[PDB]
Amino acid sequence: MIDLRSDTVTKPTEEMRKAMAQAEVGDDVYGEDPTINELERLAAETFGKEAALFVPSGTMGNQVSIMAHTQRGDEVILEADSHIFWYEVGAMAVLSGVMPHPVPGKNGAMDPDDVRKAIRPRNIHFPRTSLIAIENTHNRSGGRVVPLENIKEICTIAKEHGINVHIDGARIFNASIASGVPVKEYAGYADSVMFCLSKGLCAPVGSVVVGDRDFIERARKARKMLGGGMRQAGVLAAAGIIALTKMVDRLKEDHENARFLALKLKEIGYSVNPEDVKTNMVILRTDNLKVNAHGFIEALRNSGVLANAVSDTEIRLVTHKDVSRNDIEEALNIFEKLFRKFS
Amino acid sequence: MIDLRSDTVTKPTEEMRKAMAQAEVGDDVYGEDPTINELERLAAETFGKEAALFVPSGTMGNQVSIMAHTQRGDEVILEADSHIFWYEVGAMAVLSGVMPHPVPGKNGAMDPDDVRKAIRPRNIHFPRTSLIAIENTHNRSGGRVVPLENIKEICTIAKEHGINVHIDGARIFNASIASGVPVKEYAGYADSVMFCLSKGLCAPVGSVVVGDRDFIERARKARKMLGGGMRQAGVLAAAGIIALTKMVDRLKEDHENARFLALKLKEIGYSVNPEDVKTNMVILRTDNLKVNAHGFIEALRNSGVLANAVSDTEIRLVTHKDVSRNDIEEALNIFEKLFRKFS
Amino acid sequence: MIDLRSDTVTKPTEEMRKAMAQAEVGDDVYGEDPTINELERLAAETFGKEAALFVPSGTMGNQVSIMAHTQRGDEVILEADSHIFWYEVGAMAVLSGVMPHPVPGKNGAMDPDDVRKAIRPRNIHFPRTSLIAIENTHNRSGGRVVPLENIKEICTIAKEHGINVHIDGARIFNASIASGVPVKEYAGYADSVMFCLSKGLCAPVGSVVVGDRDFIERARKARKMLGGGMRQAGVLAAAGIIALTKMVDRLKEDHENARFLALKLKEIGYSVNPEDVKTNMVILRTDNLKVNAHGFIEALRNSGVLANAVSDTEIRLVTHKDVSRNDIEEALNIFEKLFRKFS
Amino acid sequence: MMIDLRSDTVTKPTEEMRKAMAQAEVGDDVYGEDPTINELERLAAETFGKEAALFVPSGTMGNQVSIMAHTQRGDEVILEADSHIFWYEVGAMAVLSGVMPHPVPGKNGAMDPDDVRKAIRPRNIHFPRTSLIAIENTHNRSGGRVVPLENIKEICTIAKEHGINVHIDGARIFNASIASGVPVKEYAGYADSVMFCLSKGLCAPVGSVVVGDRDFIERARKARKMLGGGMRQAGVLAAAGIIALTKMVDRLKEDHENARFLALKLKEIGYSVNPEDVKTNMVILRTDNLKVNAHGFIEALRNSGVLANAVSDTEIRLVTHKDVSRNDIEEALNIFEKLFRKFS
Ligand SMILES: [Ca+2]
Ligand SMILES: [Ca+2]
Ligand SMILES: [Ca+2]
Ligand SMILES: [Ca+2]
Ligand SMILES: [Ca+2]
Ligand SMILES: [Ca+2]
Ligand SMILES: [Cl-]
Ligand SMILES: [Cl-]
Ligand SMILES: [Cl-]
Ligand SMILES: [Cl-]
Ligand SMILES: [Cl-]
Ligand SMILES: [Cl-]
Fold first, then answer.
1. Chains touching chain A, criterion 3+ CB pairs below 8 Å
2. Residue among D67, D118, D116 at smallest CA distance from D94
3. Cβ(A315)–Cβ(A308) below 8 Å
4. I want to staple C130 with a disulfide (CB 3.0 to 4.6 A). Which of A50, A66, A182, C74 is the partner?
5. Which residues contact D18 (CB under 8 A, 6 or more apart)?
6. What's the gap in Å between A201 CA and the centre of ligand 12?
């Protein structure tokens, strides 16, 4: 089928499958897996940080970072529509015993003044604000790119207050491709960055957290506690190395396909805004259709297209390596036929 | 001094001091303190609930209620400027491992539709919404009365979804006096209610939580875990009974004094809204002054008036039994003089 | 009835009742209650520490100390039969996220070598041992006194490893009176000490934690989070000052009464060991009786004597101010009758 | 290279596993669409006679999501005093679940049922609620000892009477089964949940599996999401797991035979070992009759080409597995014999 549900569905490339088969492994608990070690070295180097830590998921990456940055009772400033707040099972409260302090943002960009204002003064009644999280290519807003200036401004505020900064960079490479800002530049304004290998980069499993050596050591212990301490994970790291070093540039193709898809959907008559498509995501409203988002998703599936409804009136279409231009053209033929039926 | 910082500064009445001296006591851990037992019996009766639990503070009252209503990883819907979120040291995250889900409100009144939208659907990525908290006479907005209709609507939504409702009624009697709604009526739309004895009611220590027998049993065990299980606490309960049974009616005097204070401050030229003052609080804005809230608080202190800044531009003035009309008149003379200096 | 269940049942003396009624108070949240302030000053001075914190219960005292001494995932070494492990509702795990590391002891004295062995090496699999707790006049062993030499040796081990030491001194004054070791000497070999005012010292409510200024500041914030931040608690502190300054010497009377009780029970034929009784507790075994401990407790209750079973073959008898020699004599007459019935 | 007797965790993937992983049919596990993970879980559930199963990245996560699914904050978990959950899991039970461990000493990993019964908390405001009893099969610290089925049966009876959940940390449950002749489904029949490792003696590179009832597994799956174990195309790992479960269990007998040989021969040399206690893949060696300590002996072994771990200042643990052959054992023994001359 044509899977436009998310970039998480990407499958390993032939190069990855071969590398996994001949991957040199060792027990990572003893720090003896050579491939995991190289992946972490490469990740650190790539983001200009002192160290890196491989994790089974982006969620664990964010959570071990929060654990390594905070103490029980602390407060974490984050954007009101960020993944850490909405889609991580309330892990920050259970695992770290910290409270989120949602701050509204415009497509992932929290007004620096609102962030500064959300910082807690020192008083016995108040939690200590110890961390500020920023999500780049903010998902809920539709894969929008947070301006480098916004991140720089917030980094300055954090510095003045002695507050740590964490960038949820699950799709930071998509941000870099769209903005032209090198990932090292983003990373420089943060204490830690979590980036996914299993989404647009096509690795089957995992993410990586990069930051200072002491922070990473604390995160590695947190990883052990959470259950992310694997044995011969070099098999996964082999695909991870290829994802990090050879699958970044082509993300531009996903962006081009998403824009093309949006432009053509608008032409057909669907409620989409091509001008809002900055990375690999397209938001499709169903207000003008005879069935709502849930009913339309079912019609799409029957015709060979997979997508998710994010509300009763919205569907999200996401492009990635396993959605070629031919697939986009085929999907458009299907959307054309369904518009005749459901408009 | 003329202490307008909070109604918590109220000192025991002569009748309270004597009652504490002759209080009949016992070991509360064994449930043998007769005065604590009578206080809880009286509180439950007054609020139309099955049981009650005495606690050393309102913070503990709120926190044991959250513990008794939730499980780790749950989410708690509460108003964005509520005390549980801002002034309770992030306790909900540490003690219950729950995540707050802030919802904007108009003077403490969360739009029922927004509350409905904040409820989490059943999905692996989401925490379970198990509690909705409403604060009556919302502190931050200026001791504002939450409309009974608001509470009724939210109660209905909660019932629909099988969600618990907790009323932070620290100043519920102030609300009752101003609105004319009996506290028993407010309580009927909630599963639990925490009310303070140590604020406007003048008791030196404590609050009480009322609710169903099984919930109170869970709250009592939580109280033991938190360290609120005292011994001969009947000494405190003696004053509590008097606070509950003899100090409710006179709260009207505090409301009169607060309104008078606000009216006269407006005439002087200060940025206050007398029409918004319905209970014992007055929010004073410093945007039209030469110094901010922190600087003005210091000036007030030097002239005999104590108050707290609640932001860089807002000051909260609170009236209570230990601030007479004469004290208010004296404070106004001071405010008058300071307007000449800082306007 | 004749209450030998615990020393927690002690009621206020007339002097205490008068002091509570005339207590000079203030709002403790602002650090303005003069009596709480003097109690803390006196407590610190008496224990030779720079700071102190009044709390509603010994449980809260121990728990805020644990919170202030540890970080999530840490381990706390403690005696296998200590109160923090057995009678504090699993609070250490919930509030501080720490693991208890039980170490056997002989009448409360953990072998220093066993303590050194229980300290965790630096390994990713292990929690960090950050606290060692010692209970003085160890309850479960029968109110036994831990030798100063034991505490001194453990203190040295702790210093070598940079580990904190907390003394659960709920009954530290009983230990001091029996041993001749001043409480400031026990405390000199510890970082913090919690002692109760509501047991043998006869105050109706509360305990105090003593320690260094920074530690107490953290413990004070923990107290706020837990709900121990009261307002005009000076009413309680007034009785607390009398407990600390005037009720310590008479503890020798409780020790004398416990010894007399034990000697006479032995004379009757009960299985008691007068040689093990050095403070205010007597352990009686039901080994030579035709009933178990629980059945014996019931028989005692029906005859006018209250006590607690601590196992299926052992019951604990505790003396205090409210069980006079006359009461011990009357209890013995009852014990004599019951011995003929169940022996 | 060196003879690695440190642990069975160092086992490397077999040729068949490597090919199956690289060519694995995958899908997004978050959507429950990875076919290989689904088959691994189906097979695991079937093997243990349970309704459902959950793949996890580590045995630690397997145990922790089980504790989370079985308990509520403030609860107490009865477990053996020297069990892995208490000693080697970073205090996770306290941080993640807010529960207190209630250590019960055991005899060769087996807790006396009456001691377990006595450890259950009475209902009292001062006491946490006992909601879970955990049993470790082939108890590691005691030397990979096999807990009798009757011990587990008796504890199950006590738990049922009290309405308490039972979890078996079966990291090496297949080693227990091969040695005892007891099918793993029989051990599991007396438990609510069982966690077993695929990455130790079974030779898979990564992961473990938790088995149990449908509702419990659903709760454990949500816990797994919270802890960060919700992976995407994990079928790559599951492919090796299927082979571990289907083709690597029987040969564990070889690891046991190698460990028995090692123990018998070490005894013959003069080392303080008890061949009579060796029934699975572990040998405990005490350094009581050596002029060196445990850590010093480990260093000496390293210098001679043998890798082992000290588990006490006087105890070393030797573990056999697929990657240590009989010839490797003979080599280690010949070295042990000489080092006995130097340190005795
Ligand atoms: Ca993928
Ligand atoms: Ca008061
Ligand atoms: Ca008392
Ligand atoms: Ca007499
Ligand atoms: Ca392996
Ligand atoms: Ca050979
Ligand atoms: Cl290899
Ligand atoms: Cl912490
Ligand atoms: Cl009385
Ligand atoms: Cl829970
Ligand atoms: Cl006063
Ligand atoms: Cl595939």
1. B, C, D
2. D67
3. yes
4. C74
5. A21, A22
6. 16
Give the residue ranges of DSSP H helices in chain B.
14-21, 34-46, 58-69, 83-86, 91-96, 112-118, 148-161, 172-179, 183-187, 213-226, 234-246, 251-268, 293-302, 325-342
- What's the CA-to-centroid distance between D37 and ligand 1, angstroms? 15
Within an 8 Å CB–CB cutoff, is residue D272 touching chain A? Answer: no
Phi, psi of A166 (to 5 degrees): -125, 130
**Strand extents, DSSP E, chain D:** 3-4, 52-56, 76-80, 100-104, 106-107, 110-111, 130-136, 165-169, 193-197, 208-212, 282-286, 306-307, 309-310, 315-319
Tokens of C318: 């505790």
| One-letter identity of residue B255 | H
**CA neighbor of A225 nearest in space, from B96, D88, B150:** D88
C231 in contact with chain A, both atoms CB, cutoff 8 A:
no
Q: Which residue of D has its CA nearest to C86?
A: D127
**Is residue A104 left, alpha or beta, with left meaning phi > 0 and alpha meaning psi from -120 to 50?**
beta
Contact status, residue B204 vs residue C25, Cβ threshold 8 Å: yes
Q: Do C231 and B9 touch (CB under 8 A)?
A: yes
Among B93, B124, B126, beta carbon nearest to A93:
B93
In contact, D315 and D272? CB cutoff 8 Å? no
Q: Quick check: B231 and C90 CB within 8 A?
A: no
Resolution value in angstroms: 1.8
Q: Could you give the CA distance from residue D107 to residue A314 in angstroms, rounded to a whole number?
A: 61
The Cα–Cα gap between B236 and B229 comes to: 13
**Chain A residue numbers touching B74 (CB-CB < 8 A):** 90
Reduced DSSP (H G I as helix, E B as strand, rest coil) percent helix, strand, coil of chain C, to 5: 45, 20, 35
Method used experimentally: X-ray
- DSSP code per residue over D221-272: HHHHHHHT---SSTHHHHHHHHHHHHHSSTTHHHHHHHHHHHHHHHHHHT-B
Residue D333 Cα to ligand 7 midpoint, Å, equals 26
Judge: C232–B12 Cβ closer than 8 Å, yes or no.
yes
Structure tokens at D73: 């904050």
Residue A169 is encoded by which pair of tokens? 């960079």
Q: After which residues is chain A broken (C to N over 2.5 A)?
A: none
Interface contact B232, partner C, CB < 8 A: yes
Helix axes B293-302, B325-342, angle to 10 degrees: 120
B116 Cβ contact list (under 8 Å, min separation 6): B157
* Chain B neighbours, 3+ Cβ pairs < 8 A: A, C, D
| Per-residue 3-state assignment (H helix, E strand, C coil) for D92-106 | HHHHHHCCEEEEECE
Q: C125 vs A224: CB contact, 8 Å cut-off? A: yes
Separation of alpha carbons A270 and B142, rounded Å: 48
B72 vs A contacts (CB less than 8 Å): 94
Residue for token digits 């520490």? C49
Put simply, whether A96 touches C (Cβ < 8 Å) is yes
Domains and CATH numbers, chain A: 1-246 (3.40.640.10), 247-342 (3.90.1150.10)
Question: Which residues touch C237 (CB under 8 Å, ≥6 apart)?
Answer: C23, C33, C35, C36, C38, C39, C54, C206
Residue D18 touches chain A, beta carbons under 8 Å = yes
Query: Look-up: residue for tokens 């590391």?
Result: C101
Asked if B170 is an interface residue toward chain C (Cβ–Cβ < 8 A), one would say no
Phi, psi angles (nearest 5°) of residue A67: -60, -45
How far CA D34 is from CA of B228, B246, D29, D142, D146, in Å, comes to 50, 68, 5, 38, 35
Is residue C319 annotated as involved in ligand binding? no
Pairing of strands C314-318, C281-285: antiparallel
Given a contact cutoff of 8 angstroms between Cβ atoms, the answer to whether C269 and C339 are in contact is yes
Structure tokens at A46: 């790539």
How far, in Å, is the centroid of ligand 12 from the Cα of A139? 26
Report helix, strand or coil for C131: strand
Q: Per DSSP, what are the bridge partners of residue A282?
A: A317
